[PDB]
């Protein structure tokens, strides 16, 4: 294989190569154009080391505060039905609608796997909306909170067009922290420098900068409260309060044990109230810390008392629901409320003490936020250019390996040179005609008819010095074009003023009678089986000039009909009335009929098909003919197509030029 | 070997490759599903060092204190009989039951080997239960402690369904400490920061988080009773199991199946010696006259399915023989296998049928006096076969029987003689052949293989033509050459061979540009 | 391949090589002379560290203060329609006009299509100007501010000619910071040393030096402020702690803190203020031109190598003679409706045809008859050029020559010689013409010609008529030589039919277009039909140095006349 061989193969398979490469680049383009853009924000913090601070910034303790303030456990996803709907909606300029949820508590299934309860919210207008957790339809209004079926929800500032759907998940706080931490990054950048470069990635550029601002200010306020915690009374207050709360918890546990020694609604409302109590206590502590380190008119503090009022309304409604349920389960619910609230307050105060102790013994003093978080408006992902480039290169490599496989795995004949190497005489290379009448008659100026006329002139020289004027033409495999070749050869040799008889001795799949118009009664079968004479089986082709004998009816014993002496009688009789007899015969690698017939033919030619037959196939056919005493004069390569690989591997494509005056 | 040979061999064994690969992938997927998911918890600890903190955290002091606190010496395993029961029970969705045991004293059997006493608890309801250590049945109740048979046992809050069994082991404290130490790891993420990352793996996500919190607090209390260690992050469990790593398990299954399939394919390719194409025989200088294909099919195939592909190949053989057998001494054709079960009587009988339908009188002699079954095949008046004629107790006219779906006369072997080789040496055999060479146009003789017995060599001296029958894959080229040289050495010339039982192969096509199987040719109606 | 072969290939392809290299170099000079020059200013900062100061200089705080000070959110670009108008305007010596904007407030639509609002200002004179945002024209004057259509604008000191347009964009402050940070670079020349090199690039040499001085001064002020903030905090605490020896001690401490606060100069030193390098750093014109030259050369050599290795055509007669094909002539390209042998008898191609004539006289003896059939391998191989001119050169020697045009499909010898086109060869073959009605005299010729006639529907079957052989047998006694012109044998079979009656047959192979295997296939197809091709005529030979270095001869031939 040389350079010209490879260039010819590429030129030939250019259609496959172009199609595959274009498909791969199309996939790369649609990926780069439909994948969700990922933006990046970064801040700069100055530290008065910084490896403990890099590890403490990425801790669940610092991040968990950011999930708590920013409600990052409420995941809202605009609902696009396909895996591509979001991207194509972005392309068409539809602004991604967003809704603001300040309080969400789902019925909290906690099954085996789905630890993240989910609901679907459908937008009806700028004010009201529909919800459906598990088919249970609910109607809510922005503002007025919803407490229905163990679902608490407050949607504010809905900013989507009607009909927009949203999947709302209450993913667990630890999952929220994991998601935040996976996209968050902290680096000193100097190793000595107090310069910390915080980065955060995400699909919403406005939200990731809020998250990173929250993180930066959480860490800032932690280190600031470190300075004032040394003389603060909070340490002693907690050290005194924790034993009291622990004693109350132990008393509640003892009371629960004494009373013990499962109503669905009772347990559900118990969980509702416990969650409300956790949120209220955490909000009280957050309000205290904010009022210490921030102002009342600060928007955060405003959000704080608004959330507190919301939680108070929810707790009042829950208490009203409790008052309506029978006292027998009310007693158990009150005991469970006391125990669970004691446990929750104990855990929260333990976390408070832990945070205070961690803050107090920090060697770092003044920390200052140099650059507040700002989002680069150019997404860091997807990297469209490299994506499309890899798509092009991958398409090219795939096309090249497919072409290489199809070049190394092909065995069919590529040129008459392959046949003539084995010592097989090729008498014509008939090209593919793009075109029931004979081609040599419907289109006498066709290219394949010109090749067949060349075959006629070559045969007039070959067939001289033969036993008789009988020419048997046999395929190597079925669908080799054997009957096309033989019929159009009869058509061309007929117009030269010769009497041609075309016998169709394919008594198995012969269809020359249909192709010439059929008086199918009394074919070759009927003559061979003795129920017809020669004169009643010969018909005349309308557009021909040659007579033809059809196969007749398919007999059960074609090979045994052909061995009859009647066949040789017919051939000896016809060889005196006709200038040439051409016989249509089945392939020799399929049946043996051609081997029987070729004993009576003075010339025998195989028809090879261009790519569909192998050189070894042609040699096996010629040797199987020889083994039966039939000598094959040569071959007729059929169905040749123009190929540059022929023109560079050999010097000639063997396809043939078109030659007429264009008008 | 080239690319085409490799791809053809792969295509030929595509069923074997696919089956082996799919078995390996099935095993990998079954493992990835049935392997118990092992979770991971982690905690963050600050030091103000971190080299001795690791060695003290993994010490038996802290770990043993944790085990004493959480009663980690009481092992409980829900009982599923096979090594697959737990995995599939998890897969269907049954919540795994757990019973809370707080006080357990087994009698401390402490025999030669089994230092870990164990019992089986059977849950009968939410309330009571049964115990069997070595068949000793006990009945117990949640709450009320049990002190019977050297067994002290205290179960609280049975959480399961009745019928569940639980293996309860009281393993020694050092064994528990080693078990904890094996899944507990301490690392320093920054390698210079004060932070320590504590990790614990286990199958129960809640239990391991409790254990790691207890480890953290035992270390904290040990330090305080001083250099202030502080717990930054308490232990929380990653809900995604860290093992089994399903994707890599399945990928390794696929890749290993592919490798095993490929190595077996190359072993089979380099370890097969049989004939693969007629070209192999024709290289040696042997004339192959037909390559008979496998027929998917007591009637003769050339009669029950005359349009079969093998019958077409046999017709091709008939036309080859009409040309090879001229200029022969007589109309006697001896067909001999190379090895037993070379499909040789199949060929000779169907060849007799196809030569008979052409209006010729064919006589099929079954001169396999050792294992000949032509009489069985054709139906039979089994008396007076060839042996009886040879041993002198029959006339030529009494042994010939006409095949019904035939057209050719035949002579059965007769009774299996004790001296098959010495009967055939009788001049009566040559007299029979000389007589039949006038009343019949063709005589086909069935003979045993020459590499088994010498009978074919005796018979073939009186046969004008002799053809060997090879099986496609079973016989080797050297077997055919050895058979023909043994025929020559005894004065018999084998005209050529008939390759039999050819199957379609892509390796043949790519190695030799023809597969040699033959095309089907009919108009479908 | 060897040195001689590659040298010959480059010599032959020198026109392609030079043209490709010239196109690449014109692209290179166009890019180098039209790309906007980029100047670089540098300043030197010394620290008495050096790791955090680098990140502080490139921070949005320092850069944002710079942008607020210099109003870098207002971007002003002179308007040129193409990507080359600015470059050519610079080449023509047109000094780039500038306007000075001090206050801009666009409506700030901030829609998805356009995040940053933009207007276009057209200068009408030295004082007044016009503005269009999206087609709404507003007139304004320097001085008097414009507050209309939610658009406020204050333009000062228009230095431009009337008709100049400026795209004026209001950049979001963060986008201005991004642009400033992209071009601004801080480096440490010592990698440890307190010396910091500040560089800034841009197309305005004065503007970048102003911006870099602004950055350096903001950084210096911030640095000295840090020393002053601590000192002022201590002084403020002392002052708030003021309530008699302690009173005097605190007064002395207050004075010390005052003098330490005012003495601000500290950790940062601005050694070199920013000055612009007058030589633009980009585009690096000379290396760009060098890359252009080398790239053109490499592309040319690669294309030449591909064309050399992918050409299969005939290159010398020796290629044909390797197989054993007799080449009786190699006819060069004639630079030129009359015949070449008659219009230009002294042509080089006619001299080659005369050599062919003398070779043919020897080749055609011991032939069956005086019939010479000339066939091609391909159409457009120059069959009829050679046939007609050979007939002319053999007719001037005083021999009776009959030229038959047996190409019944595309024969045009009648259109060449001028024609009484009625009664050609087809009409004689079709049975509707006599032998004597079809022979015509060539005017500037000397030989008879038989035109093909009307194109028949069956050219190959007409030639099979015994009338054709009768015509040949009759003409073989009224003429000294019959030259027959046929279609190519790889197209049709007519030449193979006619060659049964010709004593000599010659193939014409076009020099570059045909292949050696093509000629071999043609001759073997002739033999298969019982026609023996005596040899070949290579036609259309061109002069090539690759042939002279590969083979020992070019085979094109010398001119030979005494020049006067």
Numbering used by the authors:
A (entry chain F): 17 to 64, 85 to 297, 304 to 477, 494 to 721
B (entry chain E): 17 to 64, 85 to 261, 406 to 477, 494 to 721
C (entry chain G): 17 to 64, 85 to 279, 385 to 477, 494 to 721
From the primary publication:
Gram-negative species couple polymerization with translocation across the periplasm and outer membrane and the master regulator of the system is the tyrosine autokinase, Wzc. Autophosphorylation of the tyrosine-rich C-terminus of Wzc results in disassembly of the octamer into multiply phosphorylated monomers. We propose that the cycling between phosphorylated monomer and dephosphorylated octamer regulates glycan polymerization and translocation.
Previous work showed that mutation of K540 in the Walker box abrogated Wzc phosphorylation. In contrast to phosphorylated and enzymatically-dephosphorylated protein, purified non-phosphorylated WzcK540M was homogeneous, oligomeric (based on molecular mass in gel filtration) and yielded discrete octameric particles in negatively-stained EM images. In contrast to motifs 1 and 2, motif 3 (268–402) is not well ordered in the C8-averaged map and working in C1 identified three discrete structural arrangements. We designate the three possible arrangements as class i, ii and iii. In the most common particle, class i is found in three monomers (chains A, D and F) with all motif 3 residues visualised; this permits an almost complete model of the Wzc monomer. Class i is a four coiled-coil helical bundle (α8–α11), composed of two helical pairs (α8–α11 and α9–α10). We were unable to identify any density for motif 3 in chain E (class iii).
